[PDB]
Short mmCIF file of N, CA, C and O in Angstrom, two decimals:
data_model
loop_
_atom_site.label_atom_id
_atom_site.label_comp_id
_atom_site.label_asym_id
_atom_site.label_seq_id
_atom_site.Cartn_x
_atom_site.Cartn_y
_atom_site.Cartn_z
N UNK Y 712 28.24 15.62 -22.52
CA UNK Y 712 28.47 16.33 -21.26
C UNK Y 712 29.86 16.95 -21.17
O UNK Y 712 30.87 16.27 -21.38
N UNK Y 713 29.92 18.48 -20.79
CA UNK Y 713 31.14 19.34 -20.45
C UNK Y 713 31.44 19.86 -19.52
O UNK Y 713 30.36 20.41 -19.28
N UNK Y 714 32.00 20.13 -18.84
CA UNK Y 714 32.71 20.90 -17.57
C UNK Y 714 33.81 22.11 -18.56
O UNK Y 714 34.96 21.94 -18.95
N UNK Y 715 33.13 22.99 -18.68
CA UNK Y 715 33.26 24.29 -19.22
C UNK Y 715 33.30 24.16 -20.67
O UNK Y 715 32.24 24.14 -21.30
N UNK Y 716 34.61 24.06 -21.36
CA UNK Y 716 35.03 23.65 -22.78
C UNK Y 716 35.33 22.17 -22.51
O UNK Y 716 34.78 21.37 -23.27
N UNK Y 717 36.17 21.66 -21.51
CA UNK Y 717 36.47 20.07 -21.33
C UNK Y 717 35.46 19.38 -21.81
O UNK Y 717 34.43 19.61 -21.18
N UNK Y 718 35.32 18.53 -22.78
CA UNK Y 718 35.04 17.31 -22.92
C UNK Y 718 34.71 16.15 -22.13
O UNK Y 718 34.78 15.07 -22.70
N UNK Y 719 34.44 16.17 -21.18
CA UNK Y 719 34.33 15.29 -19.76
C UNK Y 719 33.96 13.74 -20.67
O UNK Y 719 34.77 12.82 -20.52
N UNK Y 720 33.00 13.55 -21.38
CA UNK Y 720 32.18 12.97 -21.27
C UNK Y 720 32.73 12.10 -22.08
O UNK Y 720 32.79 10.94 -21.67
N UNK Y 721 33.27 12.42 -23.43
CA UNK Y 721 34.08 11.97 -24.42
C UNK Y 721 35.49 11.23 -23.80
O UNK Y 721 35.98 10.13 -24.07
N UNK Y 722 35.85 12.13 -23.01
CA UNK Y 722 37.08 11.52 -22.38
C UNK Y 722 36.89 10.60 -21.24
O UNK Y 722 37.94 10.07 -20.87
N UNK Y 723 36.23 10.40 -20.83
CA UNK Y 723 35.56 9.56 -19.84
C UNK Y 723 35.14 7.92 -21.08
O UNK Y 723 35.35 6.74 -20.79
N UNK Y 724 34.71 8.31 -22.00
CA UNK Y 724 34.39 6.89 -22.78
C UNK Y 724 35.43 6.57 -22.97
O UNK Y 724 35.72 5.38 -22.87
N UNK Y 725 36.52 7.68 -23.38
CA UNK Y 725 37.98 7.02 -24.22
C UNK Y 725 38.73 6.45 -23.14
O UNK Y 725 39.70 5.79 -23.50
N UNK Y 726 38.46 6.56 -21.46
CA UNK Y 726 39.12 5.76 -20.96
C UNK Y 726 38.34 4.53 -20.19
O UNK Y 726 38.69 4.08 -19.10
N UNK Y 727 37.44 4.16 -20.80
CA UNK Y 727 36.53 3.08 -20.48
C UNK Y 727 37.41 2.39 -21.79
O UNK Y 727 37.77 1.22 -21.63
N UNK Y 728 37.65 2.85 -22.65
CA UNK Y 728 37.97 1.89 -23.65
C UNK Y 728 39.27 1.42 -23.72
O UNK Y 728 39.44 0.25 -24.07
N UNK Y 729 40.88 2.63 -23.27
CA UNK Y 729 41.52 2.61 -22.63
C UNK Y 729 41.99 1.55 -21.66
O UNK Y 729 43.13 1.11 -21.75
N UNK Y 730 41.01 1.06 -20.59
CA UNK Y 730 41.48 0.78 -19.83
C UNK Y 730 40.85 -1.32 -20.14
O UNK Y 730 41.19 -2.36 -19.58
N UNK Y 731 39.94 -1.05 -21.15
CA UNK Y 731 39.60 -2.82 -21.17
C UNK Y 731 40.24 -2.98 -22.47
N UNK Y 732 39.83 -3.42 -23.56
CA UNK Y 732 40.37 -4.35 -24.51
C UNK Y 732 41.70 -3.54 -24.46
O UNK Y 732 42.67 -3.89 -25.14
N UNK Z 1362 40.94 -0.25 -8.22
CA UNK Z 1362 40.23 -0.07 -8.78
C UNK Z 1362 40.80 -0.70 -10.22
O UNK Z 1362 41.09 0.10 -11.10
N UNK Z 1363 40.89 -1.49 -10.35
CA UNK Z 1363 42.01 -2.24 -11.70
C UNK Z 1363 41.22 -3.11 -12.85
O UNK Z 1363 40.52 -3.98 -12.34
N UNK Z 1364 41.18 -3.07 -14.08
CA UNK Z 1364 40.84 -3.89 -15.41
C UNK Z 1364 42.19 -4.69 -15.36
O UNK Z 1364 43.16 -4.09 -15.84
N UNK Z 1365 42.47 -6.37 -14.68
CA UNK Z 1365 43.30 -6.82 -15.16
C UNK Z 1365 44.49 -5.97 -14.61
O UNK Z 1365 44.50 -5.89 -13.38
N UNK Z 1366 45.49 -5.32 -15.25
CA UNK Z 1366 47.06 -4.72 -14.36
C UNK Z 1366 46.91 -3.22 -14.46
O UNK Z 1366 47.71 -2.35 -14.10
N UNK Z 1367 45.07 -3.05 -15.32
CA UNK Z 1367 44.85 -1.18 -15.90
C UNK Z 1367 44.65 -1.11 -14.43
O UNK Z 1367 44.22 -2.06 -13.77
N UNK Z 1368 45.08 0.42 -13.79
CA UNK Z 1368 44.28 1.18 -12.81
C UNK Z 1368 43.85 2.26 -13.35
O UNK Z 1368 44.43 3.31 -13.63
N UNK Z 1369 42.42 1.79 -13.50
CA UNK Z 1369 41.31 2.72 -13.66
C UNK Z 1369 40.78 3.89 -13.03
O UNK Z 1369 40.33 4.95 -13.47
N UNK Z 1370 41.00 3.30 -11.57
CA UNK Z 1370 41.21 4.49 -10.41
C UNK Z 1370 41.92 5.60 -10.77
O UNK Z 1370 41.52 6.76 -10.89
N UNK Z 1371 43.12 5.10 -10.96
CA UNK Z 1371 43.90 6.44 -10.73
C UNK Z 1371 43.79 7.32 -12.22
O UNK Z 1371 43.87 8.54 -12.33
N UNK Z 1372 43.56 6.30 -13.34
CA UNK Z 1372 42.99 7.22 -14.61
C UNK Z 1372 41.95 8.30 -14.58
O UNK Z 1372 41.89 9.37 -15.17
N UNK Z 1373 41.09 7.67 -13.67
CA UNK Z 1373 39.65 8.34 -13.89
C UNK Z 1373 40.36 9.44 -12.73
O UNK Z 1373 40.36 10.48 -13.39
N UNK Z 1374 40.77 9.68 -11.79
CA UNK Z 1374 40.96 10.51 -10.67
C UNK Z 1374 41.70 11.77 -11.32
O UNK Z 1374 41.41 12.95 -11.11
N UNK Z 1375 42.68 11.28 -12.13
CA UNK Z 1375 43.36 12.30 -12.93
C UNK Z 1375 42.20 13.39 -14.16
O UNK Z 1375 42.17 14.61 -14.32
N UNK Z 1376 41.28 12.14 -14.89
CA UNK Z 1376 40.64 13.20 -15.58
C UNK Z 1376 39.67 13.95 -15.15
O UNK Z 1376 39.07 14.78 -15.83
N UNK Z 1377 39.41 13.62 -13.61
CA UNK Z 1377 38.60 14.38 -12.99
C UNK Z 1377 39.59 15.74 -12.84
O UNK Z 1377 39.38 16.92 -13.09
N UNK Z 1378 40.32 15.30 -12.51
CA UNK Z 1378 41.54 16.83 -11.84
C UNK Z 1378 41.99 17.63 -13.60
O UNK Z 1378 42.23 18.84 -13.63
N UNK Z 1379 42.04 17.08 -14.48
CA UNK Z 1379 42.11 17.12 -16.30
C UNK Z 1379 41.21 18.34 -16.59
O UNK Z 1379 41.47 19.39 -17.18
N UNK Z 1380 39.75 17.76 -15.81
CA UNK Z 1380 38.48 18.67 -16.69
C UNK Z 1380 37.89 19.44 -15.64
O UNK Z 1380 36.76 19.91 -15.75
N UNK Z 1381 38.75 19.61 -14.43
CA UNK Z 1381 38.37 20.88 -13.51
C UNK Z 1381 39.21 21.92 -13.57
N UNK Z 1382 39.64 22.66 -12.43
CA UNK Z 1382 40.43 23.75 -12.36
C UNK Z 1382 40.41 23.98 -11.25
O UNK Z 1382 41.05 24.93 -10.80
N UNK O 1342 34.39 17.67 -6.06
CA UNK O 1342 33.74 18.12 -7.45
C UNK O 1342 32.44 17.48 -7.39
O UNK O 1342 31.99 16.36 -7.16
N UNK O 1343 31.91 18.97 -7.78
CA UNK O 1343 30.56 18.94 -7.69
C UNK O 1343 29.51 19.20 -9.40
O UNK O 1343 29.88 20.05 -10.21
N UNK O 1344 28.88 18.75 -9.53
CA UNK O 1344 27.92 19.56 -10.57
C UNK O 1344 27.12 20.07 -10.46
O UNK O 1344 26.15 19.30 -10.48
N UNK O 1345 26.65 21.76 -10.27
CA UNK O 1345 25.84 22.46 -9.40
C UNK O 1345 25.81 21.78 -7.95
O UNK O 1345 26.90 21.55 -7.43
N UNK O 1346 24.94 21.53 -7.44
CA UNK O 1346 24.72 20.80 -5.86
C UNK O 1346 24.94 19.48 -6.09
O UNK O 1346 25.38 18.83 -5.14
N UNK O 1347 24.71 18.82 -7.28
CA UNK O 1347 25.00 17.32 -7.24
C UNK O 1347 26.72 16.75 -7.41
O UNK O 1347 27.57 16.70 -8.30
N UNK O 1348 26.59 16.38 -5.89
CA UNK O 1348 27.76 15.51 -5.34
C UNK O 1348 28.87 14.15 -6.62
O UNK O 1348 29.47 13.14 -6.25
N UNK O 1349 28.76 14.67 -7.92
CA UNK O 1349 29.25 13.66 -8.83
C UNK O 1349 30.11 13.03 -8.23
O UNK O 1349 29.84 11.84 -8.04
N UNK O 1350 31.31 13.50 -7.75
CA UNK O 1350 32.74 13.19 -7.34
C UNK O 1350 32.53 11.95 -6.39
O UNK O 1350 32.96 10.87 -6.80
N UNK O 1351 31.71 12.01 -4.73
CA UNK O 1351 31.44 11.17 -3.92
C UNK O 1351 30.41 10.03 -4.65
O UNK O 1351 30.22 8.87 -4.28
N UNK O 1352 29.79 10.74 -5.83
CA UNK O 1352 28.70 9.29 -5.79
C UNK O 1352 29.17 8.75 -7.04
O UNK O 1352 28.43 7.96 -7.62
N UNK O 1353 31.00 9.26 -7.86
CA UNK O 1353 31.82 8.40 -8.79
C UNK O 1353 32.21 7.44 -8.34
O UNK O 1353 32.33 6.43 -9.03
N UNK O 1354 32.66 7.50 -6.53
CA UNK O 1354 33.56 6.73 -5.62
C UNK O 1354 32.68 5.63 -5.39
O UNK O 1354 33.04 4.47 -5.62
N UNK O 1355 31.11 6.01 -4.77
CA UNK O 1355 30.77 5.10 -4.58
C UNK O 1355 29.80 3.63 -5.56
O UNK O 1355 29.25 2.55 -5.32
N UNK O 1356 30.11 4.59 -6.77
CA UNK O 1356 29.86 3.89 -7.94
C UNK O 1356 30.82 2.45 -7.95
O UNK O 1356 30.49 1.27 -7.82
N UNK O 1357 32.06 3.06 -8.16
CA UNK O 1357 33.68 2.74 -8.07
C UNK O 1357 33.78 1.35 -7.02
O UNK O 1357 34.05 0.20 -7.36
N UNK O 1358 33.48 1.85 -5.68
CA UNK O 1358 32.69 0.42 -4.64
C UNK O 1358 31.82 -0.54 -4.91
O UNK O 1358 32.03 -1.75 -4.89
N UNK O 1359 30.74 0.07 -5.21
CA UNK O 1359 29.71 -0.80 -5.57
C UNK O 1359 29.71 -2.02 -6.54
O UNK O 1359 29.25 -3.15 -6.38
N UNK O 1360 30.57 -1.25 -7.93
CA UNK O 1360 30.66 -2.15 -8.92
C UNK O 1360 32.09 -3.27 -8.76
O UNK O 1360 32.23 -4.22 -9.53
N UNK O 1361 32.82 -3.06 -7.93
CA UNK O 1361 33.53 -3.81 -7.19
C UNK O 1361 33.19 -4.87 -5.97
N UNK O 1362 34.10 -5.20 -4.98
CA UNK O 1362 33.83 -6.02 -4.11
C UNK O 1362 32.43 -5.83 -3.92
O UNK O 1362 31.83 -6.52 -3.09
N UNK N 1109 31.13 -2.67 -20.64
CA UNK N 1109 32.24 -2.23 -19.68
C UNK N 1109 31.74 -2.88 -18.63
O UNK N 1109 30.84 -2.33 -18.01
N UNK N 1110 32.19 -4.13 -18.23
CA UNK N 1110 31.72 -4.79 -17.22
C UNK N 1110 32.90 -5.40 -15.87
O UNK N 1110 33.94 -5.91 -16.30
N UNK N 1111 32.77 -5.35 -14.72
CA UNK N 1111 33.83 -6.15 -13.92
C UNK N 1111 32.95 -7.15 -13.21
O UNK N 1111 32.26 -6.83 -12.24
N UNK N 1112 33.00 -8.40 -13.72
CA UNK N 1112 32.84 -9.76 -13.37
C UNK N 1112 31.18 -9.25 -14.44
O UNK N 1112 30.89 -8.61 -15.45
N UNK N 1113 30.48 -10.08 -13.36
CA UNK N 1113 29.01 -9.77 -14.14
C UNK N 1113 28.53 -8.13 -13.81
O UNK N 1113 27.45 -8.01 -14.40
N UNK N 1114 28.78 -7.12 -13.29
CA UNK N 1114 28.56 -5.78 -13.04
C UNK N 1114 28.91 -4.78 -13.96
O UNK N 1114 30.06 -4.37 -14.15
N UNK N 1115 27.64 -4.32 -14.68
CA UNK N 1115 27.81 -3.36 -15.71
C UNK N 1115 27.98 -2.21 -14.98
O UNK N 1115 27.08 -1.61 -14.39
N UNK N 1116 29.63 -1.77 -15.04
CA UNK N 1116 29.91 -0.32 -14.17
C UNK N 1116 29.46 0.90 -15.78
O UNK N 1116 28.93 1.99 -15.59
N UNK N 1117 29.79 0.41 -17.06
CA UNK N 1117 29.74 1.28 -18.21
C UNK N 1117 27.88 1.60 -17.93
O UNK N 1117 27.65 2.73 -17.49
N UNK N 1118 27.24 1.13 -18.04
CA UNK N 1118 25.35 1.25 -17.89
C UNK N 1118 25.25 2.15 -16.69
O UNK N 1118 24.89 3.33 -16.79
N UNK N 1119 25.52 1.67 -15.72
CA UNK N 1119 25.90 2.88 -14.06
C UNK N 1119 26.42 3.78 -14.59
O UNK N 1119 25.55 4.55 -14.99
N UNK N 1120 27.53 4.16 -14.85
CA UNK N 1120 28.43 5.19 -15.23
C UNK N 1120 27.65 6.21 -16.33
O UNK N 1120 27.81 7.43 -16.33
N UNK N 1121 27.02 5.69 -16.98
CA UNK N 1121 26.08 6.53 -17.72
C UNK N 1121 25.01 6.98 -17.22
O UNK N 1121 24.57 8.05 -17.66
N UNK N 1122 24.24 6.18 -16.03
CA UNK N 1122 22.91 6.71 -15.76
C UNK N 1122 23.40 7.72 -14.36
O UNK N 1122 22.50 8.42 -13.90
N UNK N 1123 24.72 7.79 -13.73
CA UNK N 1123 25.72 8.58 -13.16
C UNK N 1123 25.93 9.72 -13.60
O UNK N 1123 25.95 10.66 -12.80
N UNK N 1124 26.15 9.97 -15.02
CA UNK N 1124 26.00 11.32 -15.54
C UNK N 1124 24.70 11.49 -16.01
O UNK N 1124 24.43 12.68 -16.21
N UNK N 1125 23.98 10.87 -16.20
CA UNK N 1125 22.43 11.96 -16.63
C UNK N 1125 22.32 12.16 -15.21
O UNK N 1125 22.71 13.29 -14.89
N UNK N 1126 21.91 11.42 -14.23
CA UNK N 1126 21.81 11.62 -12.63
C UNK N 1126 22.23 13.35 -12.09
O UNK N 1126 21.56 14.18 -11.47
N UNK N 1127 23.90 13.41 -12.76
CA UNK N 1127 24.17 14.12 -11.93
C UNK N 1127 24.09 15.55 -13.15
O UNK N 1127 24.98 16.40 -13.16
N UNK N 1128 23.06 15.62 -13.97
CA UNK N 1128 22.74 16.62 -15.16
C UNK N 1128 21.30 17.47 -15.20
N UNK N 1129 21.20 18.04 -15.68
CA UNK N 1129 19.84 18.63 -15.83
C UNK N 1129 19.84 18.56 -17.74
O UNK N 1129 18.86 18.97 -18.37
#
């Protein structure tokens, strides 16, 4: 999933992962 | 909105404002 | 922030609630 | 991606197909 060229979706996992272990 | 001392809140609020315009 | 008509932004927040307190 | 027993990562995903065509 994208919001134009953004990456939404990708960057949205990397801060699920980011933010626990 | 916090993992432990992460605020997740304010991460996720930013990449919302990141992958709009 | 919206995606077409669907309200993402308000129903991130109340995701955000829910999975909390 | 869980806070206490609440899978917000499983939500958060069925959050974006939700808000997708």
């Amino acid at each position: 999933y994208r919001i134009x060229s953004y990456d939404f979706x990708d960057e949205a996992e990397k801060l699920l992962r980011d933010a626990a272990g | 909105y916090r993992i432990x001392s992460y605020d997740f809140x304010d991460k996720f609020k930013k990449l919302l404002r990141k992958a709009a315009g």
